[PDB]
Structures are given as C-alpha cells and as structure tokens.
Amino acid sequence: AAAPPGKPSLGWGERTFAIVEVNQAATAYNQLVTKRDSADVSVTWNVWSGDPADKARVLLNDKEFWSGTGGAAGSASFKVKKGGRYQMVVELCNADGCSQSDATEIIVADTDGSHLPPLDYNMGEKNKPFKQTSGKVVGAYFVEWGVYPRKFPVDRVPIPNLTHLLYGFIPICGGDGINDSLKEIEGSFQALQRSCSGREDFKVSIHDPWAALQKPQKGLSSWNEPYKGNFGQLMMLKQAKPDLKILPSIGGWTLADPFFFFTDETKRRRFVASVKDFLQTWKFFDGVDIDWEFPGGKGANPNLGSPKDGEIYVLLMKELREMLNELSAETGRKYELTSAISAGWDKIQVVDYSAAQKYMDHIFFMSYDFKGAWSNDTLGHQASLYAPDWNEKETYTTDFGVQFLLAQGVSPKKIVVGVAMYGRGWTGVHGYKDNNPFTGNATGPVKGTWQDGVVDYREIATEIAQGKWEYHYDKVAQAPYVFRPATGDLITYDDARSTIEKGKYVRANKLGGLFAWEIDADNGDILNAMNMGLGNSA
Numbered sequence: 001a002a003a004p005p006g007k008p009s010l011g012w013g014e015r016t017f018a019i020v021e022v023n024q025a026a027t028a029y030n031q032l033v034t035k036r037d038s039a040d041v042s043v044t045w046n047v048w049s050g051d052p053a054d055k056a057r058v059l060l061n062d063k064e065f066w067s068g069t070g071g072a073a074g075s076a077s078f079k080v081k082k083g084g085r086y087q088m089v090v091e092l093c094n095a096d097g098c099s100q101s102d103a104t105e106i107i108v109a110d111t112d113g114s115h116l117p118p119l120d121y122n123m124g125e126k127n128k129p130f131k132q133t134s135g136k137v138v139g140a141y142f143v144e145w146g147v148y149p150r151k152f153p154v155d156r157v158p159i160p161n162l163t164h165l166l167y168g169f170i171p172i173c174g175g176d177g178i179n180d181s182l183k184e185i186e187g188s189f190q191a192l193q194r195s196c197s198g199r200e201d202f203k204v205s206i207h208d209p210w211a212a213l214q215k216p217q218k219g220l221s222s223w224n225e226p227y228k229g230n231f232g233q234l235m236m237l238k239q240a241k242p243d244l245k246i247l248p249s250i251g252g253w254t255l256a257d258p259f260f261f262f263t264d265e266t267k268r269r270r271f272v273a274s275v276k277d278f279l280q281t282w283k284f285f286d287g288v289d290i291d292w293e294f295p296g297g298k299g300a301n302p303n304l305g306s307p308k309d310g311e312i313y314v315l316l317m318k319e320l321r322e323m324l325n326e327l328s329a330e331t332g333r334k335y336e337l338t339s340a341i342s343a344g345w346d347k348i349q350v351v352d353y354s355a356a357q358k359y360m361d362h363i364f365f366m367s368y369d370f371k372g373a374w375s376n377d378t379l380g381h382q383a384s385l386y387a388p389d390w391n392e393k394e395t396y397t398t399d400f401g402v403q404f405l406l407a408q409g410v411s412p413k414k415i416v417v418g419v420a421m422y423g424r425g426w427t428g429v430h431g432y433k434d435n436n437p438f439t440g441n442a443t444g445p446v447k448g449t450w451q452d453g454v455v456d457y458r459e460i461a462t463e464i465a466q467g468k469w470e471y472h473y474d475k476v477a478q479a480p481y482v483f484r485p486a487t488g489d490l491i492t493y494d495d496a497r498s499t500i501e502k503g504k505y506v507r508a509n510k511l512g513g514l515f516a517w518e519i520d521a522d523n524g525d526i527l528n529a530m531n532m533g534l535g536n537s538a
C-alpha cells in the first residue's frame, strides 16, 4: 500500500564552504581572512511532478540540519558550525513514507583541520622514530621562510619525535619607529607594511601570507583548498598527532621591537585581544609563545629597552593567561602560555620569573648564541653546558644560566633547555696558544650556509665526514667544534654528544626538557639525541 514521494534529485551548486574564509589572492591580512562563526550551506533539489506541500529535511551524515516543505523543486539554506566532510542528503516525506536523494559529499572547511586528511610523514634522513614516553618537553622551531630556498615544508618535520612545535615568527603591526629592526633585512619591513595595511598597529599579523596560507604544498595544491601554505599543513599535522602542541611564536630577534611599547597599557590590551582573535581564527594553534628579545633591551634595537620591562613582561603574562582562560571557557580546550627567554644572567636579572611563572606552562631557555662572529676577539662555545677549562669564570653557559634562573625561585619543571641545530663560526683564526683555537683572534665570519657566520648542522656533519674538518670535543665544557688549521676556520655547534649530555642534565636536575632551533638545519642526528637523551622510547 505504501507510496512515498518521488526520489529528490539534487541540483548543482557549491559543494565546499568555509567557516573561516581565506582570500587566496590577498596581500593584506585584513583582506586575507574573515572569521565567521558558522558556514553557510545551500542545496537545491528537484522532483518532477511532486507535491510542494510534502515535508523536506536536509541531513548531514544522517543528522537533521534543516526542516521545511520543499516538495517539488525546493531549496534550503542553513548554518553549519563544525567543519568536516559531510554526506548531504535531501529527504522528502508524505503520509505514506519518505524518500532520500542520493548522497552528495560537501566540504565544510575550518582551521582546526576538520575537513582535511592527516598530514602523513616518513622519517627522513637520519631521523629514527620515537615514542614520547618520557613526559619531557621535546620542542623544535619551524621557520616561515623555510619553504623558500631551504626547501623545508611542514611535511619534512619528523612529528613522531616532538611534543611541541613552535612556529616562527608571528609579527606585530608597526611602521616607522615600531618595527625598525626589520629594516636591516631587505624587503621585510616593506613586506610587513603590505601585510598590515589598514590594520591597527600593535595587533598581530602574518609576515608572509603567501608562505603561510597561499603557497601550494604537498596535499594542498588544488585550486580551492581553503587553506594552503604553512597553516594548511599544520592543520593536517594536528590531525596525525592530535596531542602535538603547535604554538605561534610572536617576536624573535627582528620582530621584538613592538613589545617595548607595552608600557602603554592601551596598546598591550589591543595586542592581547588580537591574539585572542588570532587563536579563534586559527584553531590549530594551542596557545601562545612570547619571544620578546629582550625585556630591558640589548636586542636588535640599540635605542629600545628599559628596567621597567621586567614588570611589563609579567603583566603581559598575566593578561595573556587571563585571555586564554576565557578562551577556554568558550571553546572547552586547554591552552599553553610559554616564552623564549635569554640565557644570559644579565638579561634574566631584568625579569622576576618567579612572578611570571604561575601564568606559564614552559620557559624555552635560549641556551645558545653565547658566542658568535659578531666578535673577532671573543671566541668560545656557543651553547656549551659548562665553562671551558681555559676559562672557568665564564658566565655564558647552560649551567650558569639555569642555576641563575632557578636562584630566582623558578620551579625546575618549567625550564626547557635549548639545543643548537646550527654552528656559529669564524675564519682566519690566528695567534692562538696551546693548540687551542679559541685563545686567538678571527678576521671575520666563517662562510655560512644561508647567512654568514652560521652553518646548518647537516652541513657540518656532512663535511666532517668528507674529512674537511678537524673534530674536537671539549669534555669539560661538553661542546664540540671543528677547526681547519689551514684557513683558520673555527665553528661552534651542538652535536649528538653534547645534546645527550644536555639530556642527562635536564633529567638529573628535573628540568622540563629540551627544544631546538631550528628544525630544518638538522639531519636527524640531534633530534635523535634529544629523544634518546630525555629517556624516550625507540
């Protein structure tokens, strides 16, 4: 006896939608992104000779999203708040029974990666897979510019082997006076201004929208993937490892300048609000990393810095945490507040980290760049654990900084020790005593991989193997270095031996773990060492 309505046939229209719209052709951030709180779906259907007064429903994965009459040649529009891949069906009803259209798939995109398959990886180069068993922090920085000459997109990141991924860097909008430090690097200040065009200063932006959201990378080349570039892959990343913490790092050396204006409480509040907006917009992020270099000055800008920064650093941490607290209220998620701080005691002394730590999850202790080509007559270890035998009252070492930091009353668990995946070096090192090249003087920077005076560990590791270097290991300082007595070339770096030693130090002293700058300069050796040295499972 049953005679349901005719089978609805879905008309043609849009099949992909986005809760957060991204303009694939925008240079400015304000034109690049619009966050909506829901997407907006439309479906057309048609039944030749039907009863328009029948009942109609639109079902996304067998759940109701709309309800009306439709009947014969109908139409519906409704709002979807959570992204994913949905099977869409139109259902017709009369007094006998119901009819279901054939399913059509739709993509509702959103920035927590819901619409995306998991970013998958293969261990590359010397990486060996580990399990994060130790409960220790194992972090690494990923630079935005890595996708250009460096050829290191997100998919080359060995994500079984990390607990934290720091994205460097996120800028703060500012022109002349605000962000002058960017001018030492050609194109970059200008690149920022184009990005922040029409944007209030002291809000956060994206330094390179192309790299971040528009560049095609593996898995996202199709002409309408809502999100491509770096952010796109990072979304797929949280989908392979939902527990891997991905933090946006704000500042760094050449972007830290706006922080010195946060003495102005009005500007600070705008900033914190913009970070809140940033996280609601880019949901794959898990909180905030602050990289102000440095509170009190002595960073890129020789004209910026005040003792009054130590107190600002703590109020920024208080207000940021409070923002994340109400961000958690609305989203039910947990967020991390972290920060990268100097390992020099004279910069540490500026801030009361015992005062700030109650707001923070972790402190990434920049225990590298202790020495470099910025000096011809202060040669030494760039990232050593202890002072060298030929200079016992050396204050710029991992150990000294950590002890100094703890002495403020910081809880050892929050301190995450830094490891260098790069070398700093010199050339023309002459006039040294006792076959120790550090007692002499250089005539300039070593020849660098990308930049002068800096060398990727992969480059160093490979050339040591071609016999192009004299390898030595300071067993007292716990740091390696290569030397070339001919040309007078000298390079300080971290290798797997010093890195395992930092691991043993972290564990002996009940520290938080290790992190590395920067992930692309490693061949796998060092991250293997970090994991093997913190007690993780192979």
Ligand SMILES: N[C@@H]1[C@@H](O)[C@H](O[C@@H]2O[C@H](CO)[C@@H](O[C@@H]3O[C@H](CO)[C@@H](O[C@@H]4O[C@H](CO)[C@@H](O[C@@H]5O[C@H](CO)[C@@H](O[C@@H]6O[C@H](CO)[C@@H](O[C@@H]7O[C@H](CO)[C@@H](O)[C@H](O)[C@H]7N)[C@H](O)[C@H]6N)[C@H](O)[C@H]5N)[C@H](O)[C@H]4N)[C@H](O)[C@H]3N)[C@H](O)[C@H]2N)[C@@H](CO)O[C@H]1O
Residues within 6 Å of the ligand: 144, 145, 148, 149, 168, 169, 185, 186, 187, 188, 207, 208, 251, 252, 253, 254, 255, 293, 366, 368, 369, 372, 374, 450, 451, 517
């Ligand atoms: N005693 C002090 C010394 O301490 C001091 O030395 C300083 O010590 C600190 C210690 O903390 C060092 O800082 C640490 O290490 C890293 C760097 O080593 C720090 O990172 C900083 O952050 C900023 C973020 O903006 C970095 O900016 C980026 O720098 C790169 C250059 O490598 C730029 O490259 C340019 O990229 C653009 C595009 O993005 C390129 O243009 C593109 O070209 C491609 C080609 O294919 C094309 O397709 C594209 O269309 C086009 N867009 C352009 O050609 C590149 N030049 C990035 O753009 C730029 N964002 C910055 O590098 C880095 N400094 C980190 O904070 C910290 N962990 C200090 O670095 C060190 N200076 C010394 C100072 O010498 O003084 C003593 O007194």
Ligand SMILES: *[C@@H]1O[C@H](CO)[C@@H](O[C@@H]2O[C@H](CO)[C@@H](O)[C@H](O)[C@H]2NC(C)=O)[C@H](O)[C@H]1NC(C)=O
Residues within 6 Å of the ligand: 373, 374, 375, 376, 442, 443, 444
């Ligand atoms: C390291 O030493 C080199 C060479 O002594 C310095 O470079 C020279 O700087 C002077 C300054 O006018 C120039 O006349 C020379 O041409 C430069 N180099 C050479 C090879 O002649 C360099 O400035 C020193 N670096 C630091 C950080 O002190």
Ligand SMILES: *[C@@H]1O[C@H](CO)[C@@H](O)[C@H](O)[C@H]1NC(C)=O
Residues within 6 Å of the ligand: 377, 430, 431, 432, 440, 441
């Ligand atoms: C290295 O440079 C310092 C700078 O003052 C100088 O005093 C010293 O004599 C130099 N050493 C050699 C071996 O040239």
